[PDB]
Symmetry: C2
Subunit: 321 residues, 2 copies
């Protein structure tokens, strides 16, 4: 008595862990996962069955896959995110605007319950940055943000017009031990944990007191399954803020140093992430999600740090303790 | 010392009258106007020179025209509007989302000051319907509205990222004597004037006390030129509410009956327009436009009605007085 689940953009951070959690909960031939490239050699789902190559800009191949697999749920996860979007805006528009439109059409044509994530990047500096509401001014300063406002609104219209069961959350910063640190908006956090484990200098591009809403991956995974399991009648809206807890870089540093009893050498040197982060909320009001469908958080910042400092050596072979 | 002006979607109501006003102000070889079809036989600019056929979904033809004409201003006016958009959403998305993206890219590549209109249709029922602000919640219930929120935000991002001089107003209901009445959201108004002149029954699909922001075409034309003439430094934003005055159907009826001293036989019978109109503002706060660039209105509802009742017989040969 269980869903058939298509995941697109499955090689991302969320897509990888979600795919594995869905397989474990619903069995692996109940779950098909896809992405535009094949899993890299050491990628967590390299070698596994029921992972496919699919360019979501190839609308025929996209429909062919939906036609053959017959999903009842789809997690449509491809996105060019905030930092990379500012370098490759053509691709962010193609992915985040065109493949969203195709995905919604397929959800309509094939009767699929469709999850498309939005993001705190859909907010900008007029949002009311403290305990930001579900409904407020949306003035995003990144093209990624701009495309996600459109995705929210387009999905919602599909719901009203065609009865497409469109569901979404605005993802906060998502922390996990699998992620590698580059230049993403909230990547300083993961760089910080690596710096602590390697006992090397951490140059942090987000300013020390710039708070953001954040969550640890297990809580995210839980809520992403849970919003899809809810019956439609419990949902008063299509798009929900969700949060775990807020922190700034100085607070994260504090949590890590507390667990290790070692001071991280940190220099706060503004980078591209700062100006973006500063346009985003400090914290979200996620009370609609709590009330309608039971969004819950088990991790606080210190439980998260304990788990991160234990996992990262295991998953990436950095030094432990 | 004058602009070179490209108008796209020039056969619409605004496009036709604007094209003629720009020609008269700047000379006709300073103005190129285009649309996807040729002007119908009796259309106001049938026969004229410097009107072209161009499918704005043909991005090469679009660039070829910009390349050859070398505009310094572009009024990018094609749109599938609120009622028709609900019947042809594929076309509204193609036009209102894809051609907007092309137009902005061209404005960037070719250094063009670009006007793309938005609309009160970008608002929905959470906007704060009285004296709606420039910045508020945008929850449009029509696909046309959804695409215009995206246009606002995308244009604004082009401005910030690339220095594209993107300018926009949220058009209220626009009244003019040239328009013919069909099923558009605010077409009851024009049907009402025809009913009065023909002394026939008027079946009105908007409920009698449903107020909307409105303006008469000459004031619109004025503001559309004026926002483009402003120097960039006077503009504190890219998108401006503009209004003339608000009315409901009963108020319009009142104005017309007052000018004619004849009672119109009106039956208020809800149609598709009502539910849409009811999600839109009653009135707009246009004080930013007034302050930054001098938006001004000469017509009130009775001056408008006097002019409409004089023009419509002249332009369409209905009975006069």
């Amino acid at each position: 008595h269980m869903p058939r689940v298509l995941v697109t953009g499955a090689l991302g951070q969320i897509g990888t862990d979600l795919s594995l959690a869905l397989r474990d909960k619903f069995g692996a031939d109940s779950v098909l996962v896809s992405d535009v490239v094949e899993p890299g050699a050491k990628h967590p789902l390299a070698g596994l069955k029921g992972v496919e190559k699919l360019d979501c800009l190839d609308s025929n191949g996209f429909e062919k896959l939906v036609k053959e697999f017959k999903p009842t749920w789809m997690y449509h996860l491809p996105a060019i995110m905030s930092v990379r979007g500012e370098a490759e805006p053509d691709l962010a528009m193609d992915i985040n605007v065109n493949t969203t439109r195709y995905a919604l059409e397929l959800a309509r044509k094939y009767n699929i319950r469709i999850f498309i994530p939005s993001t705190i990047a859909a907010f900008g500096d007029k949002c009311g940055k403290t305990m930001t509401k579900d409904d407020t001014i949306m003035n995003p300063s990144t093209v990624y943000g701009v495309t996600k406002v459109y995705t929210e609104l387009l999905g919602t219209w599909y719901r009203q017009k065609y009865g497409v069961d469109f569901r979404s959350v605005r993802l906060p910063g998502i922390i996990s031990a699998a992620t590698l640190p580059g230049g993403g908006a909230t990547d300083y956090a993961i760089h910080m944990y690596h710096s602590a484990l390697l006992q090397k200098k951490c140059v942090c591009p987000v300013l020390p007191y710039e708070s953001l809403p954040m969550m640890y991956m297990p809580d995210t995974l839980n809520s992403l399954v849970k919003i899809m399991e809810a019956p439609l009648e419990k949902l008063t809206r299509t798009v929900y803020n969700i949060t775990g807890f807020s922190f700034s870089p100085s607070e994260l540093r504090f949590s890590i140093e507390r667990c290790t009893d070692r001071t991280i050498e940190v220099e706060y040197v503004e980078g591209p992430a700062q100006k973006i982060a500063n346009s985003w909320p400090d914290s979200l009001d996620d009370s609609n999600a709590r009330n309608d469908w039971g969004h819950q958080v088990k991790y606080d910042i210190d439980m998260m740090s304990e788990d991160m400092l234990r996992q990262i050596p295991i998953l990436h072979g950095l030094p432990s303790l």
